[PDB]
Amino acid sequence: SEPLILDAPNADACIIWLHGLGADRTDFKPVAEALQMVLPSTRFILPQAPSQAVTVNGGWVMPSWYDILAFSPARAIDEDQLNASADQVIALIDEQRAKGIAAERIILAGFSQGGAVVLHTAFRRYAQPLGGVLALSTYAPTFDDLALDERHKRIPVLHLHGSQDDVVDPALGRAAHDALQAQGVEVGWHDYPMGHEVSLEEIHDIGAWLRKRL
């Protein structure tokens, strides 16, 4: 479908947030609207993953960024749908660049599956620098292969996770963090007593990090 947008008067920054497996672009609207209050000059773009069959879920057709062929291992995914979606974001990125929004003031964000997609996008597909990346309860199914150039290390990152996350092993979560970290990328970590979800304290953390960068 089409990206739900939360514009901001005289915009000078943009945050592209992606949802989890099988969710509505409206899932992060309440969060977008709130962060917009601390960042009133920042536009929010919440795209919609298309409907695709999800192998690991029989073959149900729901919003999926990439097909997940099995709960295990991590790589057990359709890498091309992943590259497809990534391109959907790279699309969105450029559009913003066109409307005059600056690179360092463009940020990608993703929860669960979505985070994989943006993590992949920033450090594997997109060639130009970004302003940052937000990883909400995720993993990086495509990081085993990683050799960042001098520029992609300039991309600050913040990883967040629930300790009780019984959907995305926190380990795979730190993993992504440790992967980027080891290549010398400015990264941050925050876990919370919660499961595959978002928390108020977590958002304050996100907003704070943002206020410092936008």
Provide tags for this entry.
monomer; 214 residues; alpha/beta; Rossmann fold; seven-stranded mixed β-sheet; two-stranded antiparallel sheet; 5 helices; 9 strands; 33% helix; globular; carboxylic ester hydrolase activity; LYPA1-2/EST-like; Carboxylesterase; hydrolase; PLipase/COase/thioEstase
Explain what this protein looks like in three dimensions.
The protein has 214 residues and is an alpha/beta fold. The chain has helices spanning 29-38, 79-98, 113-125, 170-182, 200-213; strands spanning 4-6, 13-18, 42-46, 51-53, 61-63, 106-111, 132-136, 157-162, 187-192. It has five helices and nine strands; from the N terminus they run E-E-H-E-E-E-H-E-H-E-E-H-E-H. Strand 6 (106-111), helix 3 and strand 7 form a beta-alpha-beta unit. The longest helix is centred in the middle third of the chain and has 20 residues, at 79-98. Pfam families: Abhydrolase_2 (PF02230). This is Carboxylesterase.
